């Protein structure tokens, strides 16, 4: 019972692909296999934002607080446990560009 046709990794036309340590655990995982999400968040709770934007010395800031950039790479055990990815029915299992 082959489960995935992909077999989980996006890799074809090569023998080997570089291994990446998982953010959460640090387990080595295939770069194709890895669940990788790029995150641009803000360093600060919106309330906290109000508080700081009051006190910003340079008034020449328009959204003059930096965003936090993360390239997040999960091993499978981790990205499942941590709900980044979750179990779906056989038919949906092949759906490719899902979010909102």
């Amino acid at each position: 019972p082959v489960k995935r046709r992909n077999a989980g990794r996006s890799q074809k036309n090569r023998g080997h692909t570089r291994t990446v340590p998982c953010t959460n655990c640090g387990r080595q995982v295939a770069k194709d296999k890895a669940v990788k999400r790029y995150t641009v968040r803000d360093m600060v709770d919106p309330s906290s934002k109000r508080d700081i934007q009051q006190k910003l010395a340079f008034e020449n800031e328009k959204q003059g607080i930096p965003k936090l950039y993360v390239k997040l790479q999960y091993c499978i055990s981790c990205a499942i446990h941590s709900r980044v990815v979750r179990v779906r029915c056989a038919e949906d299992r092949r759906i490719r560009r899902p979010p909102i």
Partner: protein
């Protein structure tokens, strides 16, 4: 409290070199002279990391350009500084980094006639023309060979524009948008590029400044 730990500390106002505002930007702390320790001489090598908070008119939009300065001189309770480095905020970088285009990077080593050896890193990105939203479908990559020609060209041009200018000149040009314009004009044949950037500048080998040239660097209007 008993004996505030800063009891012995003298303060100095930083002064910026010729491309920047003559007005002091920050202030620094140092311990008083001990009769061995000479107050002014403990500061000979210090390094200042600032934005352009340093160009009064033009500053406010560029929080993206970091400038390192090094203190060449102490004059009368205020510390003069010469050029040390150029750089970029994390933000202004990961700002520019997008999937589905090619990331070009170009490193160069150059000499001023001022006697400086500099290392300039340049950054550039593939510019999509085709008018869609760049995506998994909208792939923008440029051929590796085109990348190589782009390096060769950028690099060459910089070494040329370096050898003919003083470090005052060179730094002024470097901070601002001149080189980006020119670089796009050279590069465009090979491939259209977007947000050309000078990622960093390092100063490899710096001569010491005669009183003359350090006066001519100061030269403020």
């Amino acid at each position: 409290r008993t004996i505030d730990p800063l009891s012995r500390k003298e303060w100095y106002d930083f002064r910026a070199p010729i491309p920047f505002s003559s007005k002091s930007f920050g202030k620094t702390l140092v311990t008083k002279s001990s009769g061995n320790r000479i107050a002014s001489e403990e500061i000979k090598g210090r390094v200042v990391e600032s934005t352009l908070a340093d160009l009064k008119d033009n500053s406010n939009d560029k929080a993206w350009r970091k400038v390192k300065l090094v203190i060449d001189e102490v004059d009368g309770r205020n510390a003069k500084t010469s050029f040390y480095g150029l750089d970029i905020t994390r933000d202004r970088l990961c700002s520019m980094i997008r999937k589905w285009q090619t990331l070009i990077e170009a490193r160069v080593d150059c000499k001023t006639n001022d006697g400086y050896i500099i290392r300039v890193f340049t950054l550039a990105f593939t510019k999509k023309t085709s008018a869609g939203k760049q995506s998994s479908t909208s792939t923008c990559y440029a051929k590796s060979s085109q990348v190589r020609a782009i390096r060769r060209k950028i690099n060459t041009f910089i070494t040329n524009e370096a050898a003919k200018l003083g470090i005052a000149e060179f730094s002024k040009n470097l901070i601002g948008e001149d080189y980006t314009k020119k670089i796009e004009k050279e590069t465009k044949n090979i491939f259209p590029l977007q947000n050309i950037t000078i990622r960093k500048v390092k100063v490899l080998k710096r001569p010491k400044l005669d009183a003359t040239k350090i006066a001519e660097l100061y030269s403020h209007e």
